[PDB]
Design a protein around this ligand. Structure first.
Ligand SMILES: Nc1ncnc2c1ncn2[C@@H]1O[C@H](COP(=O)(O)OP(=O)(O)O)[C@@H](O)[C@H]1O
Ligand SMILES: Nc1ncnc2c1ncn2[C@@H]1O[C@H](COP(=O)(O)OP(=O)(O)O)[C@@H](O)[C@H]1O
Ligand SMILES: CC1(NC2=NS(=O)(=O)c3sc(Cl)cc3N2)CC1
Lengths: 325, 598, 148, 325
C-alpha cells in the first residue's frame, strides 16, 4: 500500500525513464530556487567567491605582464597601484566587484587592458548581483511553508446531513493572515477499470464540494467542515462500512489552493485520506464558541469526532429504502 | 579615554608579543565573544517569535537553580571587578564589562529556554549548547592562564572564574542530559513526553504545580487573576478544577494506604503515624525551605557586623590588581548587595515553605473529610440514639476539629525548623560576642522550666476550654432547635441560665489561659531585655576580652531579636498543638465507633 | 491578633522613624514604596474579597451536606444511595479545597510583593547610611541603629 | 453578540490551543512582512546594526591578536590599517558592509584571517541586504490598504425588484485605479442545526449574487447595487421583518476579491452586515447622474436609503400568495 499524497502533503510519485534533452537545464533559475537553503547559500557564496578569484587571477596576471610585481626602481606607473602579490589582486577584485574601493589599490589610466577588465568585472558583477538578488527574493517570497499552517483533520467522517450520507472533512487556518480566493478541490483516487477493458491505475475523479452555488471557493477564517454529498453521480455511491479498511484502494485527496494576502503568491495545501483513515458513523465536534470578547476556536478539539447513529448500508441502499417508503 | 585595557605604561597591556593567549586582558576580550554571539543569535529568534498545555524538559529545576547561582556569581564578579579597578587612574573595562555582558547573556539564555519550554522547541536548544560550549572554552583558557601565572586561591577572581567554569560545565551537562533524554538532534527521535493530563483538557486553572521556579516562587501566574478580578468578579467558573494530585479522592486513597500499612486499629497515635506516612514528605519539603530561610536570615546580622566594622575603621600580578576574599567581604556596599540578595532568597524560600505547608493541610482536610463521610455511611444509628455522639459533634468534626488539625499542619514546619535556627543563632552569638553570649544564653535557658510550666498550664486550660465549649454549643443548639417549646412553656430563661453556667465554666478556663498567656508574653518579652542587659553589662564590666563596638553590639542585637521572635507565639503554638491533639483524639474515637454489620 | 498587630504596626513606625532620623534622605525614597504598596493593596484587596467570599459560599454546601447526611442516614442507606452521596461529597470538597487554594496563593502573591518591598527598604537604607558614613560622619553607631 | 467580521472588515476570530511545532517559526519572512511598520523598521535597523557590531568585535579582536592596537615602533604591517580602538573597528565594519570604503582603514594582505573575514562579512552583508530588500519590497507592495478604499454601505436593504424580494447592498471604489477581476462572494453566517442533530456554530452558507450569467465577477467603476434574489433555495427564504433585530443571530458577509491594476497583487475587502443593520422596506437612492462633462457619482448619498412600500411577509408567504392567485 502506497499513498499518492502523504498526510503532510507531499506527493510520493517517483518519476523515472525521463530522457533529458536539456529542459531541466534551460530553467537554471527555477532549479536554483528549488534548492534548499544550505544549497542556495552554498551556490550564493560560491558564485561570488569564484568571480572574485577569477578576476583576481586576471588582475594578478596583468600585474605580472606589466612588471608591477617586480621591484621597480622608480618612475614606473603600474596598471593597478599597490599590487605586490596574488592576495593584493584578490583584495582588489573584492574592492572592485562589491564596489568597496578602499583605494590603496586602484586602477591607473596607463594600461587600457586594466580599464577594459574593470568594465568587464563591473558588468559581470552587476549581472551576478542582480541574478542573486532576484533568486533570493523569490526564495524568501515562497509560500510553500505558508501552506504548512493550513491544517487538515487526521480522520474524515461519513455521516448523515439532512438525510444525504455526505463525506465530510475539516480544514483550519492557523495564522490570522487571510488566504485570498481559497478554493477546495477534492478528488477520489482509485484503480478504476472501464467496461471496455481500460485499466487506469490512479484514475482521479473529482468530487463536488457541497458548499455554495456550485463553487469551489471557501472563506476560511474559522475551521470549516467541508462536505461532499454522496449522491447518485458520486464515485462513493457504492461505498459501504464493510469497506474503509487498510487493504482498500480508495483514496480521497483534498487540495486547498489560495493566494496569501501578505505575499501575493498562490499556494496550495495538499492532503490525503486513506480508506482506513475515513471513519463511518462519526461526527466532528464543534470547536467554535462565543467567548466573552468574541468568537474563540478551540484547536485542541480540531480533529475530534463523536460516534453518531448512522445506517450501516451503502448510499444506494439508503436511496432504495427511500424509494420503497 | 575609555579603553578596554587601561592605558598604563603607554598602553603596554595591548602588547601581545609574549603569546597573545597568555597575555592578560585579551582573554577577557575573548570572553565577550560567546555572550555577544548568544545575544545576536537569540534576539531575532525571540523577537520574531497561547499554550495551555506546556510541559517541562528534564533538569528543569536544576537548570533554574544553576542559572540563579550563575547570576549571583556574575554579580559578585562585577562587584570585585569594580573594586579592583578603582585604584588605577585609567578604568579597566576588561574587569567588569565582560562580567556584565555575561550577566545579560545569562538572562537572555534563561528567557530563551523558558520560551522554548513553553513552546516545545527542543531542536533550537542546540544554539544554547553552542553558547555554553563557547563559554566553557573561553572560561577554561582563562582559568588555565590564571593557573599558569600562579594566581592561587587567595585571590577572589580565581575562585570566581573556577565557579564560572564549574557552572558552565554543569549547564553543559544539563544540556547533554536533555539531548540524551529528548533526541532533538539527528537520531531516532523516539521520545515524546506529552502534556500532563490535568493541563491539556480537564480545565484546571491552578497552575502552581506546572509553572517554572521563578513563577513558582514569585507566584507570577496569579497576576492575571489579580487583574481580572478588577474587570469581572471571581466565581466558580474563573476558578477551575482541582489537579489530580490535589483531588480529595487521591489524598483519601493515600491516607487509606497509610492506614492499611499501619494495620499490616484507630487510636490517636495510629492516626498521627498515618498522617506522617501520607503527608510528611511534603512537610519535610516545607521544613527544608524554612530551614534554608532561617539560615539565610542570619546573613542580616553578619552583614551588619561587617558593614559597621568597615565604617568604624593588594597584588599586582599580570598588570591588574587582584582582590582577596577578605577585602571583598570587608568593603561595606558589597555586603549590602549581598544582604539584599540574601533577603530576597530568604523571603522566597519562606513563602514557598508557607505555601507547601498550607497546600499539605488543605489536602489533609480533604482526606480527613472523605474519611469522616466514609465513616458516616458505615456508621450505626445506635451511636446517635444512645447519647454516645450527637449530630452536632459529628458536624463539628468537620467544621471545627479538621480545621484545628489543618492549622496545626500549617504550623508544623516552623516547629520542626526552630531548633536548627536556635543552635546556629547561639553559635553565631558566641562567635560575635564570646563568653558574654554564653551568659545571655544561660539567662535564656534558666527560665525554660518556667516556660514549660506555663505551657503545661496553658495546655490544661485549653483542654478545659474545649471541653466546656463543646457542651455549651450542644446546649445552645438544643435550645435554638426547640425554641418554640421554650417560649410556650416560658422556659427560655432557665435554659439560657444553663448555657450561662457552661459559659461561666468556659470563661473560668479562658481566664486561667489568659493569665498564663500574659505571664508567657511578659516572660518572652523580658527575657530579651534582661539577656541583652546582662550581656552588654558583662561584656565591659566583667570581661575585658574586646571593646564593645557598634558592629558587635548591633549584630548581637539583631541575633537576639531573631532568636526570640519564635518565642513570642508560644501561647498560640501550644493552643494549636493541644487543639490538634484533642481533634485527633476525638477523630479516633469517632472512627473506632460501632458500624452496621453486613 | 490584637497583640501581634500592635507589635507589628508599632515596630514598623518605630523603625521608619529611626531610619528617618539617621538618614532623612530615606524619606525621599519612603514616598514611592508607599505608592507601590498602595497599588498592591489596590489590586489584591479586590481579588481577596472575592476569594474569601467564594471560600465561604463553598463551605456552606459542604457542611450542610454533612448535616443532611447524618439525620437522613437511614433514608440514604435505604435507597442504596451511599455512592451517589459520597460523589456529592467529593464534588463539594473539591470546590471548597480549590477556593481555599486560590485564597492561599493570592495571599502568597501579596506576601511576596510586600517582602520584596521590605528587602528594597533594607537596600535603600543601607545605601544611604553607608554613603553618609563615607561622606558625612554618622559616628559609625547610628548606621548600626538604622540597619538593625 | 459577537461579529464574525467587523464593519471595517477585520475578523474577530480568536485562535487558541494551537500546539506549535515550529510552523510559525519556519516562515520567518511572512511573519516579517506581517509586522507593523515600526516593528519592521526596528528589525531592519537592528539587523544591520547588530551585524556591523558583530563584525566590529571580530575586527577589533584581530587587531588585538596581531598587536595592531599596541603602539608599534615601526616596520609592522597591521591586518587592517589605522585601527586604534573599538570605534575604528566599528567604522571599518560599517565601511566594509555598506561598501563605502573611506580608505583610512583598509585590509592589508598580510593576515589571511583578515581576508577570510572580509569574504565572510561581504557574503553575510549581501545576504542581509538581499533579504531586507525583498522584505521591504513585499511590505510596500501589499494591497491590504488598497482594500480600505473599497467602501461598503452601512445598511443593507431587503426589497422588491421585479417581484422577487431580493437582498441588496452597495459597493463603491474610491480610487480611479481599476481593480481587475473583481469577484463578489456573499455568505450567510448563523448557528444552523441539522435535522440529525449536528450543531455548527458558524455555518457559512454562500448565497448567489444575481449579477450576470451565474458568475461572481463584477465590473466596479461606479458604485453598484449588488443584490441576491431570495428564491426557494436561499437560506433567507424564511426571513421575516419580525426578525432583523439586534438579538437575531443572522449575519451576512460580503467579500470583494480582486487584483489591483497598478501593483498586480490580489486583495479582498471583507464586510459584515448584522440583522439589525439590514433594513426591510427601504431602497438605495441613485447617486450617479449625467453631469455636463461626463457621469458623476455623488458619494455623499452613497449609503442613503428611502422607504419604499414592500410586503411585510416572508418570501415563502409571498410565493404562496402568488400560488393562490
Ligand atoms: N491544536 C492544533 N494545532 C495545529 N494543528 C492541529 C491541532 N489539532 C489538530 N491539528 C491538525 O489535525 C491533525 C490531527 O487531528 P487529531 O489528532 O484527530 O486532532 P486532536 O489532536 O485534536 O485529537 C493534524 O494533522 C494537525 O495538522
Ligand atoms: N463620501 C463617502 N466617502 C467614503 N466612504 C463613504 C462615503 N459615503 C459612504 N461611505 C461608506 O458608507 C458607509 C456609511 O454609509 P452611510 O453612513 O449610510 O452613508 P452616508 O454617510 O452617505 O449617509 C461607510 O462605512 C463608508 O465606508
Ligand atoms: C527591634 C530591634 N531592637 C531591639 N530588640 S530587643 O531585643 O527587644 C531589645 S532589648 C534591649 Cl535592652 C534593647 C533591644 N532592641 C531592632 C531589633
Amino acid at each position: 500500500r502506497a499513498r499518492f499524497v502523504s498526510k503532510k502533503g507531499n506527493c510520493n510519485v517517483a518519476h523515472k525513464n525521463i530522457r533529458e534533452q536539456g529542459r531541466f537545464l534551460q530553467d537554471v533559475f527555477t532549479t536554483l530556487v528549488d534548492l534548499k537553503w544550505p544549497h542556495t547559500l552554498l551556490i550564493f557564496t560560491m558564485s561570488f567567491l569564484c568571480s572574485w578569484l577569477l578576476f583576481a587571477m586576471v588582475w594578478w596576471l596583468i600585474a605580472f605582464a606589466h612588471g608591477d610585481l617586480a621591484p621597480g626602481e622608480g618612475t614606473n606607473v603600474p596598471c593597478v597601484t599597490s599590487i605586490h602579490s596574488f592576495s593584493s589582486a584578490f583584495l582588489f577584485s573584492i574592492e572592485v566587484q562589491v564596489t568597496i574601493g578602499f583605494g590603496g589599490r586602484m586602477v591607473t589610466e596607463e594600461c587600457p587592458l586594466a580599464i577594459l577588465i574593470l568594465i568587464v568585472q563591473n558588468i559581470v558583477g552587476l549581472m551576478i548581483n542582480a541574478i542573486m538578488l532576484g533568486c533570493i527574493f523569490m526564495k524568501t517570497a515562497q509560500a510553500k511553508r505558508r501552506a504548512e499552517t493550513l491544517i487538515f483533520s487526521k480522520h474524515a467522517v461519513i455521516t448523515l446531513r439532512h438525510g444525504r450520507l455526505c463525506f465530510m472533512l475539516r480544514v483550519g487556518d492557523l495564522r490570522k493572515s487571510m488566504i485570498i480566493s481559497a478554493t477546495i478541490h477534492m478528488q477520489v483516487v482509485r484503480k478504476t477499470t472501464s467496461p471496455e477493458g481500460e485499466v487506469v491505475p490512479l484514475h482521479q475523479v473529482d468530487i463536488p464540494m457541497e458548499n455554495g452555488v456550485g463553487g469551489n471557493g471557501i472563506f476560511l477564517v474559522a475551521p470549516l467542515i467541508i462536505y461532499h454529498v454522496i449522491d447518485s453521480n458520486s464515485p462513493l455511491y457504492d461505498l459501504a462500512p464493510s469497506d474503509l479498511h487498510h487493504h482498500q484502494d480508495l483514496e480521497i485527496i483534498v487540495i486547498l489552493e489560495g493566494v496569501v494576502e501578505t505575499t501575493g503568491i498562490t499556494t496550495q495545501a495538499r492532503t490525503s485520506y486513506l480508506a482506513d483513515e475515513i471513519l463511518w458513523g462519526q461526527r466532528f465536534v464543534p470547536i467554535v464558541a462565543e467567548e466573552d470578547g468574541r468568537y474563540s476556536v478551540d484547536y485542541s478539539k480540531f480533529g475530534n469526532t463523536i460516534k453518531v447513529p448512522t445506517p450501516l448500508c451503502t448510499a444506494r441502499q439508503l436511496d432504495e429504502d427511500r424509494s420503497l417508503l | 579615554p575609555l579603553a578596554f585595557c587601561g592605558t598604563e605604561n603607554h598602553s603596554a597591556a595591548y602588547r601581545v608579543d609574549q603569546g597573545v593567549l597568555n597575555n592578560g586582558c585579551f582573554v577577557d576580550a575573548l570572553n565577550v565573544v560567546p555572550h555577544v554571539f548568544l545575544l545576536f543569535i537569540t534576539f531575532p529568534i525571540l523577537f520574531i517569535g497561547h499554550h495551555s498545555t506546556w510541559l517541562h524538559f528534564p533538569g528543569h529545576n536544576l537548570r533554574w537553580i544553576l542559572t540563579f547561582i550563575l547570576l549571583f556569581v556574575l554579580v559578585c564578579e562585577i562587584a570585585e571587578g569594580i573594586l579592583s579597578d578603582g585604584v588605577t587612574e585609567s578604568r579597566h573595562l576588561h574587569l567588569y564589562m565582560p562580567a556584565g555582558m555575561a550577566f545579560m547573556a545569562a538572562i537572555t539564555s534563561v528567557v530563551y529556554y523558558h520560551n522554548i519550554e513553553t513552546s516545545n522547541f527542543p531542536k533550537l536548544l542546540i544554539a544554547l549548547l553552542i553558547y555554553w560550549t563557547l563559554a566553557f572554552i573561553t572560561k577554561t583558557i582563562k582559568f588555565v592562564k590564571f593557573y599558569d601565572h600562579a594566581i592561587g586561591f587567595s585571590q577572589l577572581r580565581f575562585c570566581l572564574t573556577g565557579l564560572l567554569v564549574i557552572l558552565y560545565g554543569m549547564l553543559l551537562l544539563v544540556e547533554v542530559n536533555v539531548i540524551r533524554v529528548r533526541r532533538y538532534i539527528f537520531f531516532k527521535t523516539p521520545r515524546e513526553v506529552k502534556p500532563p493530563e490535568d493541563l491539556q483538557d480537564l480545565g484546571v486553572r491552578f497552575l502552581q504545580p506546572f509553572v517554572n521556579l521563578l513563577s513558582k516562587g514569585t507566584y507570577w501566574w496569579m497576576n492575571a487573576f489579580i487583574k481580572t478580578a478588577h474587570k469581572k468578579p471571581i466565581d466558580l467558573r474563573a476558578i477551575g478544577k482541582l489537579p489530580i494530585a490535589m483531588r480529595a479522592l487521591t489524598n483519601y486513597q493515600r491516607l487509606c494506604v497509610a492506614f492499611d500499612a499501619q494495620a499490616r486499629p484507630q487510636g490517636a497515635r495510629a492516626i498521627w503515624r498515618a498522617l506522617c506516612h501520607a503527608f510528611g514528605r511534603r512537610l519535610i519539603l516545607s521544613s527544608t525551605f524554612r530551614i534554608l530561610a532561617d539560615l539565610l536570615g542570619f546573613a542580616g546580622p553578619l552583614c551588619i557586623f561587617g558593614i559597621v566594622d568597615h565604617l568604624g575603621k593588594k597584588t599586582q600580578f599580570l598588570g591588574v590588581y587582584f582582590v582577596s576574599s577578605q577585602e571583598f567581604l570587608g568593603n561595606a556596599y558589597v555586603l549590602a548587595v549581598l544582604l539584599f540578595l540574601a533577603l530576597l532568597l530568604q523571603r522566597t524560600f519562606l513563602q514557598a515553605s508557607y505555601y507547601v505547608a498550607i497546600e499539605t493541610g488543605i489536602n489533609l482536610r480533604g482526606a480527613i473529610q472523605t474519611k469522616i463521610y466514609n465513616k458516616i455511611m458505615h456508621l450505626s444509628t445506635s451511636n446517635l440514639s444512645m447519647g454516645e455522639m450527637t449530630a452536632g459533634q459529628i458536624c463539628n468534626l468537620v467544621a471545627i476539629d479538621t480545621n484545628q488539625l489543618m492549622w496545626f499542619f500549617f504550623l508544623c514546619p516552623n516547629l520542626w525548623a526552630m531548633p536548627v535556627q536556635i543552635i546556629v543563632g547561639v553559635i553565631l552569638l558566641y562567635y560575635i560576642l564570646g563568653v558574654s553570649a554564653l551568659i545571655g544564653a544561660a539567662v535564656i535557658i534558666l527560665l525554660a522550666p518556667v516556660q514549660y510550666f506555663v505551657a503545661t498550664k496553658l495546655s490544661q486550660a485549653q483542654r478545659s476550654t474545649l471541653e466546656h465549649s463543646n457542651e455549651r454549643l450542644k446546649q445552645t443548639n438544643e435550645m435554638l432547635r426547640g425554641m418554640k417549646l421554650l417560649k410556650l412553656y416560658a422556659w427560655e430563661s432557665i435554659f439560657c441560665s444553663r448555657v450561662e453556667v457552661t459559659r461561666r465554666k468556659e470563661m473560668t478556663s479562658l481566664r486561667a489561659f489568659a493569665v498564663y498567656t500574659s505571664i508567657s508574653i511578659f516572660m518572652n518579652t523580658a527575657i530579651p531585655i534582661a539577656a541583652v542587659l546582662i550581656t552588654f553589662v558583662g561584656h565591659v564590666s566583667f570581661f575585658k576580652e574586646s571593646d564593645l563596638s557598634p558592629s558587635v553590639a548591633f549584630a548581637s542585637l539583631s541575633l537576639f531579636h531573631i532568636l526570640v521572635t519564635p518565642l513570642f507565639l508560644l501561647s498560640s503554638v501550644v493552643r494549636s498543638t493541644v487543639k490538634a491533639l484533642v481533634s485527633v483524639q476525638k477523630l479516633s474515637e469517632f472512627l473506632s465507633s460501632a458500624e452496621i454489620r453486613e | 491578633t490584637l497583640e501581634c498587630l500592635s507589635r507589628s504596626t508599632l515596630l514598623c513606625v518605630s523603625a521608619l522613624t529611626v531610619i528617618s532620623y539617621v538618614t532623612p534622605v530615606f524619606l525621599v525614597a519612603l514616598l514611592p514604596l508607599a505608592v507601590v504598596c498602595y497599588f498592591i493593596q489596590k489590586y489584591f484587596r479586590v481579588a481577596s474579597r472575592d476569594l474569601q467570599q467564594l471560600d465561604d459560599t463553598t463551605q456552606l454546601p459542604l457542611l450542610s451536606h454533612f448535616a443532611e447526611t447524618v439525620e437522613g442516614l437511614t433514608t440514604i442507606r435505604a435507597f442504596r444511595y451511599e455512592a451517589r452521596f459520597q460523589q456529592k461529597l467529593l464534588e463539594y470538597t473539591d470546590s471548597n479545597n480549590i477556593a481555599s487554594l486560590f485564597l492561599t496563593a493570592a495571599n502568597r502573591w501579596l506576601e511576596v510583593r510586600m517582602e520584596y518591598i521590605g528587602a528594597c527598604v533594607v537596600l535603600i537604607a543601607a545605601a544611604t547610611s553607608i554613603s553618609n558614613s563615607l561622606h558625612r560622619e554618622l559616628s559609625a553607631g547610628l548606621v548600626g541603629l538604622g540597619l538593625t
